[PDB]
């Protein structure tokens, strides 16, 4: 039920340093990562909105030094169907 | 009223909430929360500003003092939202956006290696925190204004295996001391010095 | 909280010689490798910050002779929550 | 003259040198130097023992603390040859030797694993050594007589890389507060307790 | 384990919360919050007596003082339900009950009508509560054991608009100093005295 | 030597001489007298000036300090004439008339009503005087220089039913805190701010 | 209630009046004034004991220290008649008589000729009177009860131009530490010891 | 990273080594050695500069503080050569000749004779050194910057029979107080005031 | 094994100040010096990995002031065989 | 821990006159000389820091008039580890 | 043996104030003085080198105010033959 936040970075390194800075910056739960092929990988964090949007900015700001940051977005409340089908942690 | 610091602390790393507390004689924070920091002159408006925060939110304050010169404000709470809400009220009391804060200055930043067995024992006279074991290494920073420093002090242990010495968000200048094994300090200091410039502000 | 060093390389061969030159450089532990698809490959090592710092600088310099090196990063204290969710050799 | 406790430490450990320096108000100690601290009664009579001791040797007088009844005076110098002289010089003025001293007995010992944040704020708030960080274990030990507590610190830091939050060998019963990880506290608390129990003497 | 004093106040009155808060070095109290203070010996058991309460409930640690023999630990919380969890746990921590507590006894009481200016300068100059102004009447009360002093202030300010000059519930006898006009000094001291007499316990 | 403040205090209102004296470590004044106030830089000429008063009159000094910054002098006695005689000599040492004093500045003057229970205990960190009960109200003033405040601090209670918080006649600026139920503060503050503007001096 | 010591000093000497004044926290004494100091127990009775002297005469209160058990109240006043009256006036409250005071007994006496540099650093660093300079002799004497030590200081400075290093008439034995050349210390130690012995009382 | 003071003390006069040290919480000096004195802005570089001395020599530091404002540098040792070696490196860390230091300013130097018995006790509130007996005399000095003063305090006792009061190499200004019989003060001031001006430097 | 720090100077004086500054700048052990003849002299220090790296940087800057400094190099963890055949202080 | 002064000269003669001029200039002990090969030689002096500082700056100005003087330096306190591994006349053996 | 330091003045007064300030300024031993006739008198101090050179500077600086200072000089190491013949205290 938590809110959502993601970063995807052409480069497994960029994801880690991004995924790191997110955890260190807020009280969010890092669920894992999803491999889309082609060198692109996506980090996934979950938690309250105020936490994520504060954590995510730290990720974007920290990966741009060492990565090709592709996209960064935040969903404050994913509709029930999303959590049900996609692997975003909070899956019954 | 004029503005000096406006720093928003995300989630403090543990050893600060300790050292923060022995420095404070107010509502001590605990590790894992959030806190806010704003410096203004003259140090009475600080006392009024604290209401707009305290009355309009569910926060908790540690620093409200004029033991050094004029005063500085910190409030703490677990939910970033409540704090970010509390902070937003403070600036609006002055009707100045974020970018009205003063750009920080980097006065003296240097790393000292293998401190002499003498000098360790004497520095700890400033025992606000930990002690510099004899012959490790030490990091020292100065910034203007003073409030900006505690942000850096966070980014240290958050980024390296360092022992935290002493912090000065009080005064006309922000001064910092760090201690710990050698290689970390370079990785730690690299984060600290980088933390101050990255701030956006006015000339 | 053992440190963390990472080399990413567009070419399997780069990762090997990078990994080899690293374990030979300082006292670090090679924990495995990660395939992000797209031909990108990443080596992962843990150990002392001074060791990782010096090992990585010896790996980057050793791989440039072979395949193109994408990224090189070093994380002194990775947060506890990373080593738990991501496959970085220290999952308890 | 009553000889309560007199334990000569072969070499002050790395951390204790700071803690002694963080609290002493006389000749500061230095790391690695051997030091003997002598506890006698009356506490006003220590001023005569050291004044007799200071004129006879080349040692440095570190602390002269006047308690209600007992007195402890410690001299420090790295040269082991000087260390044996001052005690014999001090003890032969008090008309006794070493085997006449009181044998130390461990009064109370308790290790509290994983201190909560509320205690972490309160723990280091009463300490002048290292800050107690949240989550680490803290070992509290008490020694009788009080002066004998110093052997605990040199024993802990030698056997483990632990941090001394506070140490006070002044008063009726000595308080020794050490902090660290679960395993590291285990071996030291084992080494410290055996050290307090194995100190030879009488009652 | 010896339970010396344990009186839980249903709700701290408006003035006393500052007086308790004006001197503490831990978690500050707030007005309207319920607070339990338990005094026990030996003082090494207070770190464990409180530790049972802190780990079992969400209470805040107000005071933890390790004296020469006795120890006092105070916890506070606005939720009246929270008081029952820690207190029964605290009493069970040191293994006791209700009838085993000490029955309060008023040790010594003296009211000096119309304090002269010379005393007004001397009185509060050693006080951190309200200042004693010249010409006002001052009522000095002492309670034995020391822990019972907390009930004195909470009784006075509730029943009368008096000013609390000083309160110290640490030591051999607890100090309660209240000041005011001739009539106001009478009623508060009356409410304070009956509280010591009606406290159920043993000797 | 230069002149900043020259304030001649007529008959102190009672509760000041407490807070005046309980703050002071000199010849404490008493309520019902008269006192004098003159600020000059640098804070040593003060030390010489104090004699010219004491040599030429029958007075008595309370404030003589450089614990804040540079020093400030007050002398007090019951007879207005003796003080006015003492003061007039001081300026004559300087060969300066009365009206050379700097006109005061009115920097920040605001009234704060129904303060939250938190901010009370935290202000009391400055426990130099009385306590701000939870939820009364507070007045805050700033003037340059600092000496003018005791004039304002006097004329306040002289005009309203107030509890006195804390005063700064020391430092680069004069800052003021007041406590009590609402209408008095609004009635009190009006007298203080009016006291500062009305002073005749040089720009 | 037991009145321990009550010694009226003919006139406080020039150095001690400063030494008493350099450490006192109440109504300051002045040089040349005659002074009576009364020591009684319990300390809670001192608030009434001194008030009896202040309410009957125009004297000034120099020291009124209420300890945990013993209490000392010292008065000074320019009126020789009031000074002689107040002692008789003070005792005529506590149902005691003059010969009923405790006779002082010289507890411990030690003369250390030519203080060493190491002792010179330690000596005055814990003293509030004059600094002990290197090469001078230091005589340490203790008297029981403690209050009679003031007669020692007035005896030394009157009979010799020596320096009062410390004087504390609070505790079990009063400490008087005087410094000077070998010969100058000689006469003082004779005058001080005989002065303590002639004090009338009981055992 | 500019330079303010650079004073080299030859062989300290005895009574300073007490007062020098008793004010300090570092490696206390002793009478007959040599010491160095350097003021630099900004006040952390001192801590770094302290190594270059300590590492390249056999010295020992007494002053290491930021209790006043920013910090100040002194190192001391018996060998003039070793200190002058330490000094030569300290400036070399800054790469500045001697003659770059600021010329001192002479703010207030005046002699006051037969101080009234009152003013003695109050100066002694600053009882950091000796006490002004009632009615001897006092010398007072102010210089910019502050570090130069300890030189002056030296050249005084080096030239006259004086009691040393209190010294400030700390702060925005260096202020000095002297005490002793009358004619010497006249003889002392002539030496001190002459000591400060004769230094060569830049405005 | 212990790290390795070396400095090669064409002047005996250069070596000493280079040697001294190092052991003054970090917790390092100075083993000795090997004079290869022809005015070339090499000082050798061993200790922790970073301490050496910091020691050298302090010697090079210190030695350049009084001599033709030639070479500065650092080896974090040399092979076992190296210490076995060379006079580098860690010989059994 | 006594201080240290050194002079390195390309050629034997310079070193001697550099050495001899030093010990005559101040209170110092000349401990020996060091041959680093390639014609370079070095004089080594120990004593209190004021002498060596006065000794060297007297030797340089006295050797500079003969041969190519390579370097001149002074250490007021060689670290105790140096005196053990290096031949500076204070080796504890 | 010990070092040397001298001042000579035309006037027994001028020498004393110089002889004083020197002793107060350093740890030196004042041996005495040699009368050369014609009003010329010479003060002689011996001790540590740094001490004398620091002591002498204060003396010369102090005699110039009230005296006709003739000469000021310092010998750091008098040859043994001097101390044997001339009267500078240190005479076997």
Curated annotation (Swiss-Prot), chains B, D, E, F, G, H:
Keywords: Bacterial microcompartment. The keyword Cell wall biogenesis/degradation does not apply. This is Bacterial microcompartment protein trimer-2. Artificial BMCs can be made in E.coli by expressing (Hoch_5815, Hoch_5812, Hoch_3341, Hoch_5816, Hoch_4425, Hoch_4426, Hoch_5814) or (BMC-H (Hoch_5815), BMC-P (Hoch_5814), and 3 BMC-T (Hoch_5812, Hoch_5816, Hoch_3341)). Cargo proteins can be targeted to this BMC. These proteins have 2 BMC domains which evolve independently of each other, giving the term pseudohexamer to the trimerized subunit. Although the homotrimer fills the approximate space of a BMC hexamer protein, the BMC-T trimers are more compact. Their universal presence in BMCs indicates their structural importance. The homohexamers form pores at least 5 Angstroms in diameter; in the stacked homohexamer 1 pore is open and the other is closed. In the BMC the inner pore is fully or partially closed while the outer pore is closed. It is found in: Bacterial microcompartment. The keyword Hydrolase does not apply. It comes from the Bacteria. The lineage of its organism: Bacteria, Pseudomonadati, Myxococcota, Polyangia, Haliangiales. CDD domains: BMC_like_1_repeat1 (cd07051). A minor component of the bacterial microcompartment (BMC) shell. Expression of 5 proteins in E.coli (BMC-H (Hoch_5815), BMC-P (Hoch_5814), and 3 BMC-T (Hoch_5812, Hoch_5816, Hoch_3341)) forms 40 nm artificial BMCs with a molecular mass of 6.5 MDa. One of 2 stacked pseudohexamers in the BMC. There are 20 BMC-T pseudohexamers per BMC, composed of mixed BMC-T1, BMC-T2 and BMC-T3. The shell facets are 20-30 Angstroms thick, with 1 of the stacked BMC-T trimers protruding to the exterior. Residues 2-104, 105-203 form the BMC circularly permuted domain. A motif (Pore gating residues) lies at residues 67-68. Disruption phenotype: Not required for efficient BMC formation; when deleted from an artificial operon (Hoch_5815, Hoch_5812, Hoch_3341, Hoch_5816, Hoch_4425, Hoch_4426, Hoch_5814) being expressed in E.coli, normal BMC shells form. Homotrimerizes to form a pseudohexamer. These stack, with the concave faces together, in purified bacterial microcompartments (BMC). Belongs to the EutL/PduB family. One of its GO terms (cellular component) is bacterial microcompartment.
From Swiss-Prot, chain J:
It is found in: Bacterial microcompartment. The keyword Cell cycle does not apply. One of its GO terms (cellular component) is bacterial microcompartment. PROSITE patterns: BMC_1, BMC_2. SUPFAM superfamilies: CcmK-like (SSF143414). Homohexamer with a small central pore. When purified protein is examined by atomic force microscopy it dynamically makes uniform patches about 35 Angstroms thick with hexamers in the same orientation. In the BMC the concave side faces outward, with the N- and C-terminii exposed to the cytoplasm. This is Bacterial microcompartment protein homohexamer. InterPro entries: Bact_microcomp_CS, BMC_dom, BMC_shell, CcmK-like_sf, CcmK/CsoS1_BMC. It comes from Haliangium ochraceum (strain DSM 14365 / JCM 11303 / SMP-2). Residues 3-87 form the BMC domain. It comes from the Bacteria. Disruption phenotype: Absolutely required for BMC formation; when deleted from an artificial operon (Hoch_5815, Hoch_5812, Hoch_3341, Hoch_5816, Hoch_4425, Hoch_4426, Hoch_5814) being expressed in E.coli, no BMC shells are made. Artificial BMCs can be made in E.coli by expressing (Hoch_5815, Hoch_5812, Hoch_3341, Hoch_5816, Hoch_4425, Hoch_4426, Hoch_5814) or (BMC-H (Hoch_5815), BMC-P (Hoch_5814), and 3 BMC-T (Hoch_5812, Hoch_5816, Hoch_3341)). Cargo proteins can be targeted to this BMC. Artificial BMCs can be made by duplicating this gene with a 16 residue linker between the copies (making an artificial BMC-T). The shell assembles into balls with holes where the pentameric subunit would be, and can be used as a model to study assembly and permeability. The only hexameric shell protein in this bacterium, it forms the majority of the bacterial microcompartment (BMC) shell. Expression of 5 proteins in E.coli (BMC-H (Hoch_5815), BMC-P (Hoch_5814), and 3 BMC-T (Hoch_5812, Hoch_5816, Hoch_3341)) forms a 40 nm artificial BMC with a molecular mass of 6.5 MDa. There are 60 BMC-H hexamers per BMC. The shell facets are 20-30 Angstroms thick (a single hexamer layer), with 1 of BMC-T trimers protruding to the exterior. Keywords: Bacterial microcompartment. Belongs to the bacterial microcompartments protein family.
């Amino acid at each position: 039920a938590d809110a959502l936040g993601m970063i995807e970075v052409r480069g497994f390194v960029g994801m880690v340093e991004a995924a790191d800075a997110m955890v260190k910056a807020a009280k969010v739960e890092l669920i894992g990562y999803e491999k889309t092929g082609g060198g692109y990988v996506t980090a996934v964090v979950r938690g309250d909105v105020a936490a994520v949007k504060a954590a995510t900015e730290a990720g974007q700001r920290a990966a741009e030094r060492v990565g090709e940051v592709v996209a960064v977005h935040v969903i404050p409340r994913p509709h029930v169907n999303v959590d049900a089908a996609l692997p975003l942690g909070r899956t019954p | 009223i004029t503005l000096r610091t406006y720093i928003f602390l995300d989630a403090l790393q543990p050893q600060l909430a300790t050292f923060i507390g022995k420095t404070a004689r107010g509502f001590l924070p605990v590790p894992g929360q959030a806190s806010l920091w704003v410096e203004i002159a003259p140090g009475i408006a600080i006392n009024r500003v604290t209401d707009a925060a305290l009355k309009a939110t569910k926060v908790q304050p540690a620093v409200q003092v004029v033991e050094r010169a004029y005063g500085l404000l910190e409030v703490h709470h677990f939910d970033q939202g409540e704090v970010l809400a509390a902070g937003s009220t403070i600036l609006d009391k002055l009707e100045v956006r974020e970018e009205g804060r003063l750009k920080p200055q980097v006065m003296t930043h240097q790393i000292i290696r293998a401190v002499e067995a003498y000098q360790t024992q004497i520095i700890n006279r400033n025992s606000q925190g930990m002690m510099i074991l004899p012959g490790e290494s030490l990091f020292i920073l100065e910034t203007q204004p003073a409030g900006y420093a505690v942000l850096a002090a966070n980014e240290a242990e958050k980024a390296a295996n360092v022992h935290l010495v002493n912090v000065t968000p009080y005064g006309a200048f922000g001064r910092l001391y760090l201690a710990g094994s050698e290689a970390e300090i370079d990785a730690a200091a690299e984060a600290a010095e980088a933390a101050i410039r990255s701030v956006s502000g006015v000339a």
